[PDB]
């Protein structure tokens, strides 16, 4: 199925995914098109932070959903 991602700079890209895809799988797909390292990525769906170990299914993410790709920050 197809979903949309809004990138760091608000570009809209399209990904081909399945409900069984993990968040890491999606980050990898994003890296393919955008060149952004997985460990620099935070993915958001409808306000909720998406976690590496889990699947699109786990979050009830359906076709033509839009996710938000956000630069991950590391401050202390």
């Amino acid at each position: 199925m197809q979903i949309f991602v809004k990138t760091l700079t608000g570009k809209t890209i399209t990904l081909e995914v399945e409900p069984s895809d993990t968040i890491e799988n999606v980050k990898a797909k994003i890296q393919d098109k955008e060149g952004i390292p997985p460990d620099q990525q935070r993915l958001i769906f409808a306000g909720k932070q998406l976690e590496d170990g889990r699947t699109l299914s786990d979050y009830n993410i359906q076709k033509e959903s839009t996710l938000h790709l956000v630069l991950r920050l590391r401050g202390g």
């Binding site: 809004k6 700079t9 608000g10 890209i13 909720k48 590391r74 401050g75 202390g76």
Partner: protein, 248 residues
């Protein structure tokens, strides 16, 4: 183990271990003006930032975090901060992301998600699409820079017609609006209407953050940080955000 523990705390097994680990921590606190401030140690500031933020926005919690937040404000951050680390799979010492933490916490805000809405309109060569966001999704909003100018009108490309498109906020009614930066800190003027902001300085892979509220900077490390209207913001928050449009 049991899951009326894992579900009362809102944490999976791995995170619940971290939570238990962090319950041993003692977090020293002091007042500055009317804000409770955690003493800085061990890469603390992304914890501290969120905590000052929540106070500025007069936020309350439901569930387990209700009493955890009450205890923090009464001087004992242990239960609340433990959940904070656990929610981000972080150990004390780790540097991390205040906006990640704030999104985790927002799930448990005692807030009007029931009636919260954003009415939006996207325009492209496909035509004009009106649509609506509700609940928590409507309140937590990714932007390129955290002020209302960058929130109310956003731009992208439409994958269907290939034209640049325009997505605008037509109407809003929210218990709070939480703006967070999508591409790291971006230096802009904050809105005077923002009850608080988070500023991030240094490398995004090794930085330091602090919160601004009531015309002051609350950096739990640098006690003489100067407030700056124009700063490298990653976060801005508004209380009872309401707006209905015009555009002609």
């Amino acid at each position: 183990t049991d899951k009326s523990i894992l579900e009362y705390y809102g944490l999976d097994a791995q995170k619940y271990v971290i939570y238990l680990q962090t319950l041993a921590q003692k977090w020293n606190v002091q007042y500055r003006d009317n804000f409770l401030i955690l003493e800085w140690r061990d890469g603390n500031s992304w914890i501290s930032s969120a905590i000052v933020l929540l106070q500025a926005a007069k936020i309350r919690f439901k569930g387990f975090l209700t009493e955890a937040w009450a205890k923090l404000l009464g001087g004992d951050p242990t239960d609340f901060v433990a959940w904070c680390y656990a929610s981000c799979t972080a150990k004390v010492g780790d540097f991390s992301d205040a906006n990640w933490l704030l999104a985790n916490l927002a799930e448990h805000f005692d807030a009007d998600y029931t009636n919260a809405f954003l009415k939006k309109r996207v325009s492209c060569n496909c035509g004009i699409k009106s649509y609506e966001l509700r609940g928590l999704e409507a309140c937590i909003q990714p932007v390129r820079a955290t002020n209302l100018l960058h929130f109310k009108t956003q731009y992208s490309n439409c994958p269907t017609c290939g034209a640049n498109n325009t997505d605008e906020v037509i109407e809003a009614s929210l218990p709070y609006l939480l703006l967070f930066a999508t591409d790291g800190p971006a230096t802009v003027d904050c809105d005077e209407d923002a009850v608080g902001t988070v500023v991030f300085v240094g490398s995004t892979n090794s930085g330091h953050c602090y919160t601004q509220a009531a015309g002051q900077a609350f950096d739990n490390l640098a006690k003489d940080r100067k407030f700056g209207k124009k700063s490298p913001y990653i976060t801005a928050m508004y209380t009872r955000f309401a707006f209905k449009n015009e555009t002609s």
